[PDB]
Short mmCIF file of C-alpha atoms and ligand atoms in Angstrom, two decimals:
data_model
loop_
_atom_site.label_atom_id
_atom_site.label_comp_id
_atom_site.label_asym_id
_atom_site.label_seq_id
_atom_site.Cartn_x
_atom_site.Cartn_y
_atom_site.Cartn_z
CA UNK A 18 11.30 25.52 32.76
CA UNK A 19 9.78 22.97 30.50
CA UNK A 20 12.52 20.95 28.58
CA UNK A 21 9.69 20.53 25.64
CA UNK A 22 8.11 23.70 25.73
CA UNK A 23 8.34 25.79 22.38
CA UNK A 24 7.19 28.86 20.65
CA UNK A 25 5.43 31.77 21.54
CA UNK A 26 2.54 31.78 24.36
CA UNK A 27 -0.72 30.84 22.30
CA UNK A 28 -3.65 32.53 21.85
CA UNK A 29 -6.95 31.71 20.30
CA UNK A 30 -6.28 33.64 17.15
CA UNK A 31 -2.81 32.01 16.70
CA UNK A 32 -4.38 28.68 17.10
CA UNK A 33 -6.87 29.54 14.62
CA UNK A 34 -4.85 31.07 11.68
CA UNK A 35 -4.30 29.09 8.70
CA UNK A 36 -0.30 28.31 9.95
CA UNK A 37 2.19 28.65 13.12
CA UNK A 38 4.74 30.31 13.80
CA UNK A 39 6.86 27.75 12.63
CA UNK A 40 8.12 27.95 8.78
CA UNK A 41 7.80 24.20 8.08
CA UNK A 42 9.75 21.82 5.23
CA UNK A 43 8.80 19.05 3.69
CA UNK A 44 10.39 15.53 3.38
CA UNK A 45 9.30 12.96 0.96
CA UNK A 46 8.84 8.87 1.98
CA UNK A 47 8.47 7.27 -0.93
CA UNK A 48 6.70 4.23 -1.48
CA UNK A 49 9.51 1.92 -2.28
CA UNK A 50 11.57 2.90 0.40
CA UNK A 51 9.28 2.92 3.33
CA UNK A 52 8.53 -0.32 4.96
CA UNK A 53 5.60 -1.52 6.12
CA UNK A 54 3.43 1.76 4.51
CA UNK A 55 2.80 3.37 1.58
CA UNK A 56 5.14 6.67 2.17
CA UNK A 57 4.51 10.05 2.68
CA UNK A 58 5.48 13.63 3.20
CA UNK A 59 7.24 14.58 6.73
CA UNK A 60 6.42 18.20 7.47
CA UNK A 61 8.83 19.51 9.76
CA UNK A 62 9.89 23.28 11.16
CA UNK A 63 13.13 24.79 9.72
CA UNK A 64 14.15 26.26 13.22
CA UNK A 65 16.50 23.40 14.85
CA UNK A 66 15.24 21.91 18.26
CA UNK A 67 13.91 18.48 19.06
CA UNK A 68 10.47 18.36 18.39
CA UNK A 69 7.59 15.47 19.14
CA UNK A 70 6.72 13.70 16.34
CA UNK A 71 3.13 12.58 14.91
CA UNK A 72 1.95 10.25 12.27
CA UNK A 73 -1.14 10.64 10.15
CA UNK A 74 -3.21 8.04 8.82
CA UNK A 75 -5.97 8.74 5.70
CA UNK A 76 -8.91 6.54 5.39
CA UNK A 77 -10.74 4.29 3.36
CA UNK A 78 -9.96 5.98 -0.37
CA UNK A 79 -8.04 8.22 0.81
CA UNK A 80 -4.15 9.59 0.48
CA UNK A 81 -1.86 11.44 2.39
CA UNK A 82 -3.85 14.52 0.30
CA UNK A 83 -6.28 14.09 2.50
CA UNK A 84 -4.95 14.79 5.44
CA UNK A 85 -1.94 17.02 4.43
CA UNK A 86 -3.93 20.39 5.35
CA UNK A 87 -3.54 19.10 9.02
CA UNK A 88 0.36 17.33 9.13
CA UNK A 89 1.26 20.74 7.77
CA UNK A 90 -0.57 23.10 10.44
CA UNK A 91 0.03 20.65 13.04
CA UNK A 92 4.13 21.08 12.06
CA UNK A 93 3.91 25.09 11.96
CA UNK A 94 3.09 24.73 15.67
CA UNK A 95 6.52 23.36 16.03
CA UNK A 96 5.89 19.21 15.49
CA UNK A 97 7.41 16.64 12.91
CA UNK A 98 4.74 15.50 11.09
CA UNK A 99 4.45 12.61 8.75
CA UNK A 100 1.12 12.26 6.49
CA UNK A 101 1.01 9.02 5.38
CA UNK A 102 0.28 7.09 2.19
CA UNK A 103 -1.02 3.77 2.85
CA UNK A 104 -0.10 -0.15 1.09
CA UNK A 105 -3.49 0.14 -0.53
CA UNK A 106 -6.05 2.94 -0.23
CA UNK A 107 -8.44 -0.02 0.89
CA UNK A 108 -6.54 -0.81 4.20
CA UNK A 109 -8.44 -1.63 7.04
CA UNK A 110 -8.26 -0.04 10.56
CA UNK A 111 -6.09 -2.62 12.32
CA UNK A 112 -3.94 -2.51 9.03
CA UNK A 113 -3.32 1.09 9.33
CA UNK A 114 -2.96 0.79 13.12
CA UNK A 115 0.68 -1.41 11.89
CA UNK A 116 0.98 1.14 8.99
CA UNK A 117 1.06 4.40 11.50
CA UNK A 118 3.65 2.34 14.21
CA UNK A 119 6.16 1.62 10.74
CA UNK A 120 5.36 5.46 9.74
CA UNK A 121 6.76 6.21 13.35
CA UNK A 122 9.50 3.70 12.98
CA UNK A 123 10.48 5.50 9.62
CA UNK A 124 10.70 8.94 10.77
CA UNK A 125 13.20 7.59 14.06
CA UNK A 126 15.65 5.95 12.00
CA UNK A 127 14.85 5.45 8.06
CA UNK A 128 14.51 9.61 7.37
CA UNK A 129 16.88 11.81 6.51
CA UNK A 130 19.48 13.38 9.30
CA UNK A 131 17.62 16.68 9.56
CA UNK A 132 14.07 14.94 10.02
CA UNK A 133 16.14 12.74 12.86
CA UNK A 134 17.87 15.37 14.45
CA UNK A 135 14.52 17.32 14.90
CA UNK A 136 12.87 14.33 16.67
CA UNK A 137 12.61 13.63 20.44
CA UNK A 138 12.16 9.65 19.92
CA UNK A 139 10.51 9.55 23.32
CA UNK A 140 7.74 11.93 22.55
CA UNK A 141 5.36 10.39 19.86
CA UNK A 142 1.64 10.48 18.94
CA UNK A 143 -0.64 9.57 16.34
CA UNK A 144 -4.03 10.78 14.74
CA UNK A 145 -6.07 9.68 11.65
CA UNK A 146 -8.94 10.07 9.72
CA UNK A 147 -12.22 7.74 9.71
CA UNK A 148 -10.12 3.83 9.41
CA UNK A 149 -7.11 5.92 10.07
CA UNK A 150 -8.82 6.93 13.55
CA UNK A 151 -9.92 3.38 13.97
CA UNK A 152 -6.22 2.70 13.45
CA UNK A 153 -5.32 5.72 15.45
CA UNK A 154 -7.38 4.05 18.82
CA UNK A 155 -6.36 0.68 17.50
CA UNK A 156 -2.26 1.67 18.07
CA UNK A 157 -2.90 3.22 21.26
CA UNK A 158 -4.61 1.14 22.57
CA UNK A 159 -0.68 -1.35 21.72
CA UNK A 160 1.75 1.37 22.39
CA UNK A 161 0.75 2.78 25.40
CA UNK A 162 4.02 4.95 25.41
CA UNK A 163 2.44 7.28 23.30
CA UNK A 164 2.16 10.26 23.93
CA UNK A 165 -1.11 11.45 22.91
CA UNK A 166 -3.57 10.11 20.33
CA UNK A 167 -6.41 11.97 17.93
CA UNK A 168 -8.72 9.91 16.12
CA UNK A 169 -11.18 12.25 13.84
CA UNK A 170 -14.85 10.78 12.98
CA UNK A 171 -13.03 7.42 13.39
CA UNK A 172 -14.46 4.34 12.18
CA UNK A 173 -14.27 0.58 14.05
CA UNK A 174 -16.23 -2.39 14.35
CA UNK A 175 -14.27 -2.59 17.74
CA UNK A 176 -16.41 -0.37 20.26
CA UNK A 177 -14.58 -1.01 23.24
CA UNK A 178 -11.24 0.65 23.56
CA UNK A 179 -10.57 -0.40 27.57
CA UNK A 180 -7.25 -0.43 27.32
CA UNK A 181 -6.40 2.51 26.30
CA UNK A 182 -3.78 4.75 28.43
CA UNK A 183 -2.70 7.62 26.18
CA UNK A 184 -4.88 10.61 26.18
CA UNK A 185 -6.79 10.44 23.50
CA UNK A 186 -9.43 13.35 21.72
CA UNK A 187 -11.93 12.13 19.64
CA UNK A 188 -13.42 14.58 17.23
CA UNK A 189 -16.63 13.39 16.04
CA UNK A 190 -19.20 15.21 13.26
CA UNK A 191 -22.28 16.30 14.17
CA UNK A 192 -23.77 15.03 10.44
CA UNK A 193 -21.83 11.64 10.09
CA UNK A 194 -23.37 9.23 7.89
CA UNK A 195 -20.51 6.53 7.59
CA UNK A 196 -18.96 6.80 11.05
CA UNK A 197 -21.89 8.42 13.03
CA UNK A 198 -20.50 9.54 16.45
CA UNK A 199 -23.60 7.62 18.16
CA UNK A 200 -22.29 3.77 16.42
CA UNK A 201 -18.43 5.28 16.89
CA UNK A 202 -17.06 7.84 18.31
CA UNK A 203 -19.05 7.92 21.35
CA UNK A 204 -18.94 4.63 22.14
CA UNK A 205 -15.31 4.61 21.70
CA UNK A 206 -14.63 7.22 23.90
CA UNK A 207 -16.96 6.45 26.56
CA UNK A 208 -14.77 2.67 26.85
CA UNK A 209 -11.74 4.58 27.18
CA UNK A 210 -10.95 4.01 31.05
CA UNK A 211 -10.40 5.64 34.36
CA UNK A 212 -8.14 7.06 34.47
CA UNK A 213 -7.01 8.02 31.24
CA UNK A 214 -6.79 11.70 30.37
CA UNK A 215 -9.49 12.13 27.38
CA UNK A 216 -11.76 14.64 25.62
CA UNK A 217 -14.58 14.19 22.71
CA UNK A 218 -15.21 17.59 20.22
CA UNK A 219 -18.34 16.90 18.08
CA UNK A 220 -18.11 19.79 15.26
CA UNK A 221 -21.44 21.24 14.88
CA UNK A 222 -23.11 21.09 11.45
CA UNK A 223 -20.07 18.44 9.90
CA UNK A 224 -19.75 15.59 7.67
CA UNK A 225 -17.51 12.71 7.55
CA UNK A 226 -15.14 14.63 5.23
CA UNK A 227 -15.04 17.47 7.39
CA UNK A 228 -11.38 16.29 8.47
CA UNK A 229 -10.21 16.76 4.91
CA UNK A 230 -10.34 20.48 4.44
CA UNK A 231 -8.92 23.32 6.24
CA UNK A 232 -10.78 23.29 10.30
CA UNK A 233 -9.77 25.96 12.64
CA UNK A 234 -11.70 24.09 15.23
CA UNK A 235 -9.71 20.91 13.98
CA UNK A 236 -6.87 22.82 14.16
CA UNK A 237 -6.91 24.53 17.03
CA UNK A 238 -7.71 21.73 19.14
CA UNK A 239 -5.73 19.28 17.95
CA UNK A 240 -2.60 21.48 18.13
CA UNK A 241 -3.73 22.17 22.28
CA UNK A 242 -4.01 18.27 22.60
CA UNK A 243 -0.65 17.47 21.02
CA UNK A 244 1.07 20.67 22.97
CA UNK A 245 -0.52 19.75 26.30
CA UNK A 246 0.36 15.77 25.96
CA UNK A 247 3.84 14.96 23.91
CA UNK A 248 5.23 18.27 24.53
CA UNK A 249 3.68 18.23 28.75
CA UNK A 250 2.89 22.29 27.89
CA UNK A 251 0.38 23.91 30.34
CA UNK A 252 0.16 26.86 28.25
CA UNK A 253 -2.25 25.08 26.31
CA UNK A 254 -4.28 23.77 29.08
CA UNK A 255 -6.58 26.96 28.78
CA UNK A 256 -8.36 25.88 25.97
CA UNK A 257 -8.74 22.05 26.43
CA UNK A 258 -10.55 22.88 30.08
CA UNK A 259 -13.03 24.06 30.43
CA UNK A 260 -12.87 23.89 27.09
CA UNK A 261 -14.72 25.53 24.23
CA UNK A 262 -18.63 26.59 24.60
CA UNK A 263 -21.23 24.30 23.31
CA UNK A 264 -24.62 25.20 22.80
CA UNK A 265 -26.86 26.47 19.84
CA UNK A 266 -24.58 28.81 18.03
CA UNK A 267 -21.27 27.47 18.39
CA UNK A 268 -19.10 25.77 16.19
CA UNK A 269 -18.65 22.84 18.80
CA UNK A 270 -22.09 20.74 19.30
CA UNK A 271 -20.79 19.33 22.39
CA UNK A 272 -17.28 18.60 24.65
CA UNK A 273 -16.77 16.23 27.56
CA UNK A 274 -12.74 15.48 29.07
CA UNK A 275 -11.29 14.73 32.18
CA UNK A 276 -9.90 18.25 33.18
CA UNK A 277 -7.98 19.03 34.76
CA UNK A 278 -5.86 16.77 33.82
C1 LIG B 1 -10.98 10.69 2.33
C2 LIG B 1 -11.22 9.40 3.13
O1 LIG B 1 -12.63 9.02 3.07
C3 LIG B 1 -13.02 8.12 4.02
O2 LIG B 1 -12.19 7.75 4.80
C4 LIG B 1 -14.41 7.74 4.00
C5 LIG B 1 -14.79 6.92 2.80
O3 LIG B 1 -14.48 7.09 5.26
CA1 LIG B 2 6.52 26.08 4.32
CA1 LIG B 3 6.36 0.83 1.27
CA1 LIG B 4 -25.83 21.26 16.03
NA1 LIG B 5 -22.65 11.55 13.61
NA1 LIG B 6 -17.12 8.49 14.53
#
């Protein structure tokens, strides 16, 4: 039996619904007591176990707000999840990059005793939105003992990302005008080397800003990703390969990994 395995046998449906089967908490970072970021709120499940734990970066203008929709579904699938604040809503990618790694730092020994005694410190991953998923490539590409990174429509100047080792899913949007996947998702993730396990998810139809409201497809696949890599479930490998169905009238405009994996 997996060690890390948790919660009930997935399906689509369960993936897609608005929360997990995890009843999730909250925790709050504040600003003046988190160092080296701007604080946040730690989602975590009430159920005791170990769980892998996941930091969440906003981007350019943005706040934890922004991303909280996701920290808190990602944490009903049985994850602790801190959505971050950033030192200045103006932060660049390589500044949220350090931001995210003190985020992690803060939730493995600065939380609270029930945050700490949920986390397995040796299972960790990171995601962000847009300079948060420029950050998000940016950190794994440092910490390659990550488990598992998720930059959505990220934004770099930085188009070459061949050192990363931690699988890594971009999600791109179709319709992006400030990080369009063509200048840098794809680029990004076609730099990402052999062999590192990887997948791209363009949404059909999206924006930028898609990441900031309620996704299933977000969602979904972003909660497979971080089951399949920090918690090393196969359940989930069933919908990350082949993966979902592209084409005219789906809700995914395109998907390329490395499955298997
Ligand atoms: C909500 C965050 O918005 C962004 O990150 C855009 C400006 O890239
Ligand atoms: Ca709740
Ligand atoms: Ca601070
Ligand atoms: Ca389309
Ligand atoms: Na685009
Ligand atoms: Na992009």
């Amino acid at each position: 039996a997996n060690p890390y395995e948790r919660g009930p046998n997935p399906t689509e449906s369960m993936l897609e619904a608005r929360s997990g089967p995890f009843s999730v908490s909250e925790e709050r970072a504040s600003r003046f007591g988190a160092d080296g970021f701007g604080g946040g709120t730690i989602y975590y499940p009430r159920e005791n176990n170990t769980y892998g734990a996941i930091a969440i970066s906003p981007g350019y203008t943005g706040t934890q707000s922004s991303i909280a929709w996701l920290g808190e579904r990602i944490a009903s699938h049985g994850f602790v999840v801190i959505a971050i604040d950033t030192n200045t809503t103006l932060d660049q990618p390589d500044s949220r990059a350090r931001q995210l790694n003190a985020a992690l730092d803060y939730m493995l020994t600065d939380a609270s005793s029930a945050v700490r005694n949920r986390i397995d410190a040796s299972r960790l991953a990171v995601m962000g939105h847009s300079m948060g998923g420029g950050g998000t490539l940016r950190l794994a590409s440092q910490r390659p003992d990550l488990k598992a990174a998720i930059p959505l429509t990220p934004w770099h100047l930085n188009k070459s990302w061949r050192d990363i080792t931690v699988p890594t899913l971009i999600i791109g949007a179709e319709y992006d005008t400030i990080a369009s996947v063509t200048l840098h998702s794809k680029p990004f993730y076609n730099s990402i080397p052999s062999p590192t396990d990887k997948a791209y998810l363009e949404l059909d139809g999206a924006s930028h800003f898609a990441p900031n409201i309620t996704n299933k497809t977000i969602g979904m696949y972003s909660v497979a990703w971080l089951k399949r890599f920090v918690d090393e479930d196969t359940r989930y490998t069933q919908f990350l390969c082949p993966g979902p169905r592209t084409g005219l009238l789906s809700d995914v405009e395109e998907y390329r990994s490395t499955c298997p994996f």
